[PDB]
Amino acid sequence: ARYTGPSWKLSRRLGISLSGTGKELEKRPYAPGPHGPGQRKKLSEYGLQLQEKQKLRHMYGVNERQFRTLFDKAGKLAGKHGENFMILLDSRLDNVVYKLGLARTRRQARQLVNHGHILVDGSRVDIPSYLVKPGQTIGVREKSRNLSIIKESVEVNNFVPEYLTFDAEKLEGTFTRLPERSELAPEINEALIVEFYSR
Amino acid sequence: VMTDPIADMLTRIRNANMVRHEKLEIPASKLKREIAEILKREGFIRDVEFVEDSKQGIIRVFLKYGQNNERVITGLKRISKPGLRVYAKSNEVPRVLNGLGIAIISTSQGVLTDKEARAKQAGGEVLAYVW
Amino acid sequence: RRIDPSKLELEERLVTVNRVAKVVKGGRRFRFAALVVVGDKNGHVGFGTGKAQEVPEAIRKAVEDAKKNLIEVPMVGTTIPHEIIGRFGAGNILLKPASEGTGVIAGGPVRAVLELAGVADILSKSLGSNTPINMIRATLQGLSELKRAEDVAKLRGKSVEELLG
Amino acid sequence: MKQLLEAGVHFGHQTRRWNPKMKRYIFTERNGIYIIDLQKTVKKVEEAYNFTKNLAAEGGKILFVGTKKQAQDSVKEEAQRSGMYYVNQRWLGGTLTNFETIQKRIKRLKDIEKMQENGTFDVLPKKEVVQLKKELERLEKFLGGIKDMKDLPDALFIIDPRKERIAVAEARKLNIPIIGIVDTNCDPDEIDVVIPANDDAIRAVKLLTSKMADAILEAKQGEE
RNA sequence: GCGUAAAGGGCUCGCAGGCGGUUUCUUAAGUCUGAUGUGAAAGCCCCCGGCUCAACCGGGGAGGGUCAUUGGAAACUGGGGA
Numbered sequence: 001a002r003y004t005g006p007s008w009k010l011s012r013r014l015g016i017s018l019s020g021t022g023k024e025l026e027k028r029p030y031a032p033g034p035h036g037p038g039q040r041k042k043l044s045e046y047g048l049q050l051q052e053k054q055k056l057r058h059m060y061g062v063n064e065r066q067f068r069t070l071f072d073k074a075g076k077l078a079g080k081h082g083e084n085f086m087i088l089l090d091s092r093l094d095n096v097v098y099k100l101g102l103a104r105t106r107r108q109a110r111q112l113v114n115h116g117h118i119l120v121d122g123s124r125v126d127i128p129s130y131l132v133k134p135g136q137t138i139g140v141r142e143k144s145r146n147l148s149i150i151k152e153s154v155e156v157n158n159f160v161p162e163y164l165t166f167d168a169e170k171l172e173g174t175f176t177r178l179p180e181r182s183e184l185a186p187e188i189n190e191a192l193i194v195e196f197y198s199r
Numbered sequence: 200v201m202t203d204p205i206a207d208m209l210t211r212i213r214n215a216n217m218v219r220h221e222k223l224e225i226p227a228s229k230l231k232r233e234i235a236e237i238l239k240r241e242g243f244i245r246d247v248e249f250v251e252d253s254k255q256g257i258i259r260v261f262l263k264y265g266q267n268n269e270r271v272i273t274g275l276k277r278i279s280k281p282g283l284r285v286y287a288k289s290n291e292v293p294r295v296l297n298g299l300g301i302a303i304i305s306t307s308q309g310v311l312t313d314k315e316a317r318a319k320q321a322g323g324e325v326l327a328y329v330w
Numbered sequence: 331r332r333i334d335p336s337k338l339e340l341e342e343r344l345v346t347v348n349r350v351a352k353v354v355k356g357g358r359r360f361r362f363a364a365l366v367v368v369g370d371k372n373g374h375v376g377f378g379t380g381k382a383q384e385v386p387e388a389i390r391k392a393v394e395d396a397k398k399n400l401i402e403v404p405m406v407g408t409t410i411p412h413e414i415i416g417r418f419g420a421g422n423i424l425l426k427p428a429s430e431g432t433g434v435i436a437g438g439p440v441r442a443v444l445e446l447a448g449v450a451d452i453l454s455k456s457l458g459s460n461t462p463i464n465m466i467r468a469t470l471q472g473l474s475e476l477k478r479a480e481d482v483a484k485l486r487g488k489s490v491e492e493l494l495g
Numbered sequence: 496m497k498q499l500l501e502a503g504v505h506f507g508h509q510t511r512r513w514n515p516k517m518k519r520y521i522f523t524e525r526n527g528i529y530i531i532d533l534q535k536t537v538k539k540v541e542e543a544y545n546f547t548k549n550l551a552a553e554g555g556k557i558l559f560v561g562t563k564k565q566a567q568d569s570v571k572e573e574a575q576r577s578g579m580y581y582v583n584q585r586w587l588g589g590t591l592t593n594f595e596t597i598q599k600r601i602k603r604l605k606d607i608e609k610m611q612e613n614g615t616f617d618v619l620p621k622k623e624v625v626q627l628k629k630e631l632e633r634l635e636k637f638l639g640g641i642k643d644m645k646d647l648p649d650a651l652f653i654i655d656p657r658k659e660r661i662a663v664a665e666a667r668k669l670n671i672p673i674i675g676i677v678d679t680n681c682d683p684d685e686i687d688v689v690i691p692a693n694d695d696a697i698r699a700v701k702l703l704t705s706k707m708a709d710a711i712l713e714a715k716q717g718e719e
Numbered sequence: 720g721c722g723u724a725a726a727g728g729g730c731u732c733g734c735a736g737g738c739g740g741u742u743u744c745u746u747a748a749g750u751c752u753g754a755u756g757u758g759a760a761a762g763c764c765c766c767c768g769g770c771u772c773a774a775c776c777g778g779g780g781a782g783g784g785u786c787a788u789u790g791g792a793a794a795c796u797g798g799g800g801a
Binding site: 200201202203204226227228229230233254255256279281282284286287288289305306307308309310311320321322323324326 | 737738739740741742750751752792793794795796
Binding site: 241242243263265267270271273294296297298299300301314330 | 411412413414427477479482485486487488493494495
C-alpha cells in the first residue's frame with residue numbers, strides 16, 4: 001500500500017523535484033533530513049542505482065514487488081530495454097488517468113481512479129494498477145461525473161499527451177498508441193533502471 | 200610424430216604469422232591443398248603455388264599481410280582437435296569472430312567456408328578456425 | 331599510434347585512490363596513489379595515474395596521466411566488432427558484443443572504463459585478477475585490440491561490407 | 496640524389512655482430528664487414544631528400560642529433576651553418592621528453608648569456624663573475640644548441656643509432672618523426688627513414704650531415 | 720594448471736587401451752541432411768481470449784531424443800584393396 005509517504009522530502013532527497021512541476025521544495029533546494037543542509041556527495045554504482053530505481057520508481061510510487069514485475073515484465077516485450085520499461089511503467093491506468101487531465105495530484109488522481117469513480121472502457125476499472133491498451137475509451141464514469149475534482153481539473157490546464165487524447169465535455173478519452181517513448185523526456189534515465197535493478 | 204597435419208599447418212601459418220616471414224612452407228596434403236585454396240581464396244595470404252615433386256609435398260604460401268602488423272592472418276585456432284573432434288549441425292554451424300573472422304567447416308561437398316557452408320546449410324567436421 | 335591530443339571534454343572518473351607507504355627509517359612515509367581514468371565520451375578513454383602527497387595531488391597526477399594517453403575503441407553503435415576475451419597482465423576480461431538495449435553490464439574497472447568510454451550494450455564478466463591496475467591494464471589491452479569491421483575489410487583485402495549479418 | 500661515386504667513400508660499418516633487422520639490406524660479407532647495399536642507400540637518400548625537403552618546408556625545426564667523437568663537427572657545422580639547432584655534445588637526459596625543464600635550463604643560459612653584457616660583472620665580488628662565468632662556461636658548453644628550438648623539435652635527424660638510443664626512445668615517446676643513418680649493427684624498425692650506411696668514416700659523417708643539412712637548407716630558403 | 724606458489728611418476732620396458740605420414744577405388748560404421756513414427760497431458764517460452772486488471776484459467780502454437788524405420792552427400796575418422 002504505497003500511499004504513505006510525506007510527498008515533500010521524498011522528492012526532496014529523491015533526486016529531482018517531480019511532480020511537480022514546481023513542488024520540488026523551491027524554498028529549500030537541499031535534501032530533506034536532520035543532517036541534510038550540509039554538503040552532499042555522490043554515491044557508488046549503487047548510488048546511481050538507488051537514485052535511478054528510487055527516482056524512476058518514485059514518479060509512480062508502486063511497491064518494489066509490482067515495480068520489479070514491471071521490470072522483468074517490461075523486459076519481456078519487444079524493442080529496447082529502458083524504452084519498454086518506460087512506456088510500461090507510465091502507461092498505467094492511474095498514469096493514464098492523471099495524465100489525461102483528470103486530477104491535479106498523482107495520489108489524488110490515483111484514488112480518483114481506484115475510488116470506483118473513473119470507470120473506463122465503458123465499465124468500471126477499480127484497480128489502480130489495472131491499465132488499458134492503446135484504444136480503450138478511458139472514460140469518466142458519468143454516474144458521479146458532476147464533481148468538484150473532475151470539474152476543477154477540467155478547468156486547470158496542462159500539456160496533454162499526444163499518445164493520449166482528452167475529452168472535457170463528451171466524457172470520454174483514448175490513447176492513440178504507445179506514448180512518446182524517448183519523447184516523454186523527464187529526468188528519469190532508464191540506464192539506471194538497466195543497472196540498479198539488473199544483477 | 201605427426202599427431203595432426205592440419206595442426207602442423209596451422210602452427211606453421213601461426214608461428215610464421217608472427218615471425219614476419221615472406222613465404223611459408225607446409226606439408227603438401229589434400230587438407231593443405233583444399234585449405235590452401237579456401238584460405239587463399241578468402242584473401243589471407245598472397246598466393247599458394249603447390250610446387251609438387253617426389254616424393255611428397257610440398258606447399259609454399261606467402262604471407263599477404265602488409266605494413267600494418269597482423270594482416271589477413273591475424274590469429275588461428277584449432278577449432279577441431281584431432282583427438283577430440285568438434286561437430287556442428289546445420290543450424291549450429293558457428294561463424295567464428297562475429298563479423299571479422301571466418302571459420303572453415305569441412306562440409307560434405309567440399310571444404311567450405313563459414314558463410315558459404317551456411318549457404319549450403321550443412322555442417323560437418325569443424326576443420327579449423329581463423330579468428 | 332597516433333597519440334591523440336587533449337582536444338575534447340574529458341570525463342575524469344577516479345578508479346580508486348589507494349594508500350601507499352615506503353617503509354623507511356621512522357615509520358612509513360605515506361603517499362596517496364590513485365589510478366583514475368579520464369574519458370572523452372566518444373572513444374578517447376585513457377586510464378593511467380600517479381602518486382602525490384594529498385588526495386587532490388593524486389587527482390592532479392592522475393589527470394596528467396589522462397593527458398598522457400588515449401585509446402580509440404572502434405565499435406559500431408553500442409558494441410565492439412569482435413567480442414574477444416581480452417586480458418593482458420594476469421587479469422582477464424570477457425567482453426562480448428551485446429544488443430542495443432542490453433546495457434553496459436561490467437564490473438568495477440570495466441564499468442568505470444567502458445562506463446566513461448562510450449558503451450551502449452557490451453556484456454562483460456571478468457575471469458582472472460582483481461587488482462585495479464591489472465583491471466585497467468587487461469581491459470585497456472582488450473579495448474585496444476578489438477577490430478573494426480570497415481577497417482577489417484580495408485586491411486584484409488576481401489571486400490568492405492562483404493562480411494555482414 | 497646521392498653522389499653514387501661519392502657514396503663509395505661512406506659504405507662500411509661494424510661486422511660479425513649485425514642483427515637480423517638492419518641486415519636485410521646487406522649486400523654481402525667479404526672478410527671484414529658486411530658490405531652495405533649501395534642502391535638501397537641511394538634510393539633511401541632520395542627519400543630523405545624529398546621527404547626531408549618537403550616536410551622541412553612546413554616550417555618546423557630539424558634536430559641535428561649527434562653523439563660520437565668526431566660526430567660534432569658535422570652536426571655543429573652542418574646545422575649551425577644549416578638552420579637547425581642540434582646537440583653534438585654528450586646527450587642531455589630526456590631532451591624532447593622533458594620539454595619544460597630543458598626550457599628552464601634555457602633560462603639559465605638566457606640570464607647567463609644576457610648577463611654577460613647585463614652588468615653581471617662589477618656588481619658582486621670576483622667570486623660572483625668567477626663562479627658564474629664558470630656557470631655559463633659549464634652550461635653553454637653542454638646545452639646551448641637547444642636555443643634553436645623554442646617550440647618542440649618537429650623532427651629528429653639522429654646521427655647515432657647506438658649512442659643516441661635514449662634519443663630514439665625520446666622521439667619514440669611522442670609521435671615525432673625520427674629519420675637517421677643507422678649502422679649495420681643497429682635496429683631497423685626503430686627509425687622511420689633508414690639511412691642504411693655506416694658512420695665510422697668522418698667523410699661519411701660529412702656526406703650524411705651535408706646531404707641532410709644541405710637538403711633542409713636548400714629546400715627552405717626557396718620561398719623568397 | 721604443474722621451474723620457484725599445491726602439482727612431473729626416481730627411471731625404463733612393455734600388454735591392453737588412446738592417437739597417427741601422402742596418392743587413389745569402394746563403404747556408410749561414425750559425420751551431415753531430407754520423410755514418417757514417437758517423445759501423453761499439465762508445466763517453461765511465443766500468440767490471443769475469459770475472471771474489473773493481476774495471480775489464475777482456457778485456446779492456439781513452439782522446443783525437447785548418440786530414439787527407431789528409411790532416402791541421400793563421401794569432404795574428414797574408420798573398414799577393405801592397390
